[PDB]
Amino acid sequence: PPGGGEQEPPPPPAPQDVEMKEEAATGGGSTGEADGKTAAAAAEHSQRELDTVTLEDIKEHVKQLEKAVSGKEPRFVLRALRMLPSTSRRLNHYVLYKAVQGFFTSNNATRDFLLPFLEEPMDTEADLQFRPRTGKAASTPLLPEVEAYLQLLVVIFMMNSKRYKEAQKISDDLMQKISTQNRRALDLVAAKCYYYHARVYEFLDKLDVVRSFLHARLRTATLRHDADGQATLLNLLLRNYLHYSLYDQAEKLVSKSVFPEQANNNEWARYLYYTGRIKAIQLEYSEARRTMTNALRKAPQHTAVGFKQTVHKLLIVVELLLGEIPDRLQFRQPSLKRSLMPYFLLTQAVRTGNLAKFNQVLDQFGEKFQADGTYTLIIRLRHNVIKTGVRMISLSYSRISLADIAQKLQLDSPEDAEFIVAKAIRDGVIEASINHEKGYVQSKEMIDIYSTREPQLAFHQRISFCLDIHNMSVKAMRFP
Amino acid sequence: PKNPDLRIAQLRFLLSLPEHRGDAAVRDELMAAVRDNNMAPYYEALCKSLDWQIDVDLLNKMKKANEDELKRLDEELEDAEKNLGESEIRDAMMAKAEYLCRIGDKEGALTAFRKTYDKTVALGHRLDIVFYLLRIGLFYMDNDLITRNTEKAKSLIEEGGDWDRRNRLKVYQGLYCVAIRDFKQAAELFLDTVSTFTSYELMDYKTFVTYTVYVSMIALERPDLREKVIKGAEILEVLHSLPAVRQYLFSLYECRYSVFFQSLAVVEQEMKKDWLFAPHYRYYVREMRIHAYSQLLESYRSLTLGYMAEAFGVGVEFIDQELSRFIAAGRLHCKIDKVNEIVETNRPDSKNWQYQETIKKGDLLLNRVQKLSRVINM
Amino acid sequence: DKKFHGILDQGEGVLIIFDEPPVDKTYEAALETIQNMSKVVDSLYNKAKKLT
């Protein structure tokens, strides 16, 4: 109290000022675009959503005593804003209570009285026309309600307060959102609730009841029309079925909802991560590793985040299922030091013809493979242990005898080495052919019509992509 | 002093990592260490070399007497005589700083350096201090010292004085040889070879000729290698002295490949006795072998490797296994063959090389405007 | 040493003489504009980062 109690006055008041003016400017500007210019996608909706991911989760977790976030619940406990006098009188309540909470101590909820301080926000003549104000300022106290991390009897208060919001969410969907379309906000509201509602149904029984809801939730989305609604709910619906270690993937193979068609550079990158894992488990390796490559190079804009290290984690496996491997640890991190050592030493043993080391480091680092969820490499990469060399030989040599490839693959038998070469050309590993007359295995022909016939079949996409940039530029040009 | 000082850092390395190389290096280092009153930096070497010997206390009272002789010199100087800058207080207090590089460790020397740099206005004396940081940072290969004071040399100093920067033109690319820039920058600014006085700023001349000729044949093969190192005159004087280096040159240019490897194996074995050595020895030979293969497979489109069995060396299977590693490496653009035993090559054309470049530069800019079109418009 | 337009064979011991097209001037100057187009997009994204 002379040490820390004297350093108690500095933490409230500037978060009582500039963090308070955050949602004051957000709630004012979202209302300003909900009223006029009803196409309200281009506002601080996006940056506040980037803030509610980043800023206000780490701006405050606890309600920040001496009334910075502790005051937010008795501040917004009395919100009518109903008619023009009921707006102007609540504008006086925006003046008086922020002066009291800036001066003295108001009604401090002791972390369990937060839900009755979510009743009179829903009560006290609250409106339906201010449905962004109800939707945002109810979901934004749910993150101190979940990231308190005590997880005891607030978990059911998590369960109640989300279904409080989701009853307002569904009723807004039933009661006809005139010219606002909160779905642009309610998509990641439906995400942020169901990230931790998935955690709650991991701390309790299964979340197929969420999927039965989310099927009906995906039904009312995009039957109206899609405004990021099909994009968010599909990665939410796909994640549980991928999280369950049951069969679950041919359900996703028949999932013919593969058009989100735009995702603001963030849903599409992780969507390509999930479906790249799906096409990898049904053994289609070529299309998988190129859309896993597309997912890695689309949204890496972070600072050593980890899921970027997870899409980099699965990408090296399917490339070891087709032979090639680049430099991996050239972007080493304080946490990548843990996760570089198994995989770099894995492809170390794959490139050489050593299998005793390959079985040893399986035994050495299998428990790390248990944490990554990749048991299946031992049953399906021992295929490519013998197939990496025959890909390497047939790229090097041009017209080889099968009697010499037996010692070069150290197989010590020419009679079955015909069949390994037969299986690789059956799988399309190498395009080469075999002369079964005197033992010749010759490669392909020279560089083909590639200089003449091909390049327009690359040029057609680049015309069509660049003029659509010109089209999307011109159409979205003039707002004034 | 500090003028022949970099021979010590050679004998630190040459004694340490090859323990079999431990006969004559210890014989002329320890006697050289009891010379010049070298007392601080050898305790690490005394752990790795022979155990202990008590002349430490004898030279400690010698290193304290010379410290105290200069201690009473410059405290009386700073308390009686009050003209400063590059004055008598300056060169006495740098004689402390020169004492702590010659005898002491870096820590007392660097804090005397950063103190005396904040006092002076003549940038020549400022640049001489930066010359002293760059040398002690080259001793202990401190990569964080050298990134600072080279920026001090380029930006903060050298807008003025002139042609003492050519001393650093030997240093900026001497640091590029200890990095992996064994390719183009080191060969580019070692090309001005006219600084011959074997000084501290020009640490040696004949080894500098061997350094600028080893790095030169990787920057350029025939975009006129022959003008700068073969038609060059003052470079040709000193390689007329050294018989093996000129033999190592003209084997490559006049295309005698059998004697080229006999020279190259001597170079790699002579490479082992270097102190900026860690990126050389695995990477230099493997680059020069595929360097000679590219010009040999050039001018031919149908080579039998039995012609490479005697016009090249020996070992039919040895060429076979080394080409197979290089073709699989994504380099050495040809196709090796069995029982016809004819190495067949392939190269791109006008259309094939210009399309392979535009297919990559196009996709890089296309991916670049994917992101840029989505940063704007929400 | 480019004093000649040819190639050799060891499988037949044969000298072969050919010609080459000088008409690379279109494709040479084609991708040099991409270097100019690379620098302007780097400049625009710098301008767009400066203000939203």
Binding site: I463 | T358 | M37
Partner: peptide, 30 residues
């Protein structure tokens, strides 16, 4: 590669020049 790229990049200039002139005239209206 010449006519599809440059036509797209020039119209992309007209976006940033308009999006600057949109909101910097909007924030100075009040």
């Amino acid at each position: 590669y010449l006519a599809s790229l440059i036509r797209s990049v020039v119209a992309l200039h007209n976006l940033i020049n308009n999006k600057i002139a949109n909101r910097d005239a909007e924030k100075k209206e009040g």
